[PDB]
């Protein structure tokens, strides 16, 4: 269970960092 | 495969081996940051534990070492976030995940 929680939380934090990188693609067009 | 064989000898290093890394090191605490209302060094056992872990990380072909080292890196990464000598240390284990 501790493996299955961490392997999802790290992917969620990676998705949040990818969205934070994609916010720059909307800020550079304005 | 001899060391990571039994059910009581291969589970001590699941928790003690990250614990010996940040040993006798003034880690930045958070209780004083939660109750308002950096070390720059290492220890004697820390370099030995880092060298042992980096030589343990050389287990290729996904044997008894590489299956062990994948369950320890999300706990060692919590300790590398606080101690900046642990960025210079553990060089090969970060390259071999």
């Amino acid at each position: 269970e501790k493996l299955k929680y961490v392997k999802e939380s790290e992917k969620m934090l990676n998705d949040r960092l990818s969205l934070s990188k994609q916010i720059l693609d909307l800020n550079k067009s304005l | 495969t001899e060391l990571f064989k039994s059910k009581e000898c291969s589970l001590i290093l699941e928790a003690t081996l990250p614990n010996l890394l940040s040993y006798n090191i003034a880690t930045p605490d958070y209780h004083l940051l939660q109750k308002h209302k950096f070390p720059q060094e290492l220890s004697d056992v820390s370099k030995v534990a880092c060298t042992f872990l980096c030589l343990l990380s050389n287990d290729t072909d996904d044997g008894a070492g590489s299956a062990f080292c994948q369950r320890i890196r999300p706990l060692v990464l919590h300790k590398l976030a606080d101690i900046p000598p642990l960025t210079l240390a553990l060089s090969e284990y970060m390259e071999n995940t």
Binding site: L13, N14, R16, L17, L19, S20, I23, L24 | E8, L11, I12, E14, A15, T16, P18, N19, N24, Y30, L33, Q34, K35, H36, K37, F38, Q40, L75, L77, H78, L80, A81, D82, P84, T87, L88, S91, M94
Partner: protein, 244 residues
Amino acid sequence: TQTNPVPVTYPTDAYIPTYLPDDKVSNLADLKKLIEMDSRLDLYLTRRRLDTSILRCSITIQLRGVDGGKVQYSPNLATLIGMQTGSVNDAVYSIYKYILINNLFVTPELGEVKLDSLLQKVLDTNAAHLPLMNVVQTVNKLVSPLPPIILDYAEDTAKLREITKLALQLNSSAQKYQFFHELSLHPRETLTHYLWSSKQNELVLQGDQYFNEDAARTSDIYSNNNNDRSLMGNISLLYSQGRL
């Protein structure tokens, strides 16, 4: 805790004799089974206790719930993570994991990092190589505290002591058994051993008798005591060395 173990005066975990005959007792191996039972159970409890954590005036009011659980981020550091106000350690962990994803260390070689556009905007720097110590040190500066509401306009030690004392009583009984057992095996060379060793112990205990308070102030040490032979023979040696 300390680096070295604490020196104590009381004994702890004394030995168990193995020279006792097992045909009559048949319990020392069972006591060893109890000792290894206690060691395995204490091993599991120690591993569990280690794994369990690893004029218009303004109105200002100092609130009661000012805590360090949610501490304010700067707007430069907030857009690098994504969360508004999460924690104080999750920000450092997210910045370190973001650098580890970007692979800015190497493709010192690990201290100095490669400054990206966001890493220069959040730090107000212009250098190419900068150490991770100075990266992490500015994080305490870039985080601001939460603003208030502003309205303008035991028994185990004594038990182990009792077990150790009872084991010392067992060691005394075992040594007193072994002495009579060796005296039963051989009666000859242990009584001459007694008549030698007890005589030497009486000579050692009778070796400090001429150095008392009222015995040294009198004159029945130096005068006419040539049978003593301990002193009054080194006066030709101590005078040649200057000790007087």
